[PDB]
Amino acid sequence: YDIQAWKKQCEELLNLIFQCEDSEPFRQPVDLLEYPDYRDIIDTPMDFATVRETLEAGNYESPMELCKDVRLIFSNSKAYTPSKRSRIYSMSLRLSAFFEEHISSVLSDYKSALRFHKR
Numbered sequence: 697y698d699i700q701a702w703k704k705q706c707e708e709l710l711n712l713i714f715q716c717e718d719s720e721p722f723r724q725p726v727d728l729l730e731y732p733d734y735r736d737i738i739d740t741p742m743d744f745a746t747v748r749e750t751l752e753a754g755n756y757e758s759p760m761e762l763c764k765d766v767r768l769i770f771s772n773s774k775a776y777t778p779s780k781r782s783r784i785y786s787m788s789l790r791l792s793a794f795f796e797e798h799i800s801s802v803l804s805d806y807k808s809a810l811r812f813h814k815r
């Protein structure tokens with residue numbers, strides 16, 4: 697029932713994601729010189745460095761906020777890909793599976809702790 701424990705759990709999950717080869721396209725903002733039409737398709741850019749900086753600044757109030765920004769990384773990849781068989785999109789699907797498998801217990805433990813607080 698620790699209402700604060702989600703933050704270190706999210707820091708350690710971001711560390712695993714940065715060690716994964718599949719995160720490399722997603723670590724920094726998409727390069728607009730490399731992809732000159734990017735902002736014609738994508739209204740809200742997002743990347744893992746932005747997620748980690750928002751967490752370390754104390755600008756997430758809950759793990760659900762962090763989960764919404766990480767899911768935006770993956771939806772941007774799906775919207776920008778020219779093909780469902782593209783290399784970078786394929787990397788996004790593996791990394792999304794890994795993220796969802798790990799964030800499940802973080803969300804469950806937080807929501808249980810808050811229900812206990814408010815009992």
Ligand SMILES: COC(=O)c1ccc2ncccc2c1
Nearest residue numbers: 726773776777778782784785
């Ligand atoms: C041929 O596919 C691509 O070049 C591609 C596909 C997905 C992407 N996702 C994010 C950033 C860049 C991306 C690029």
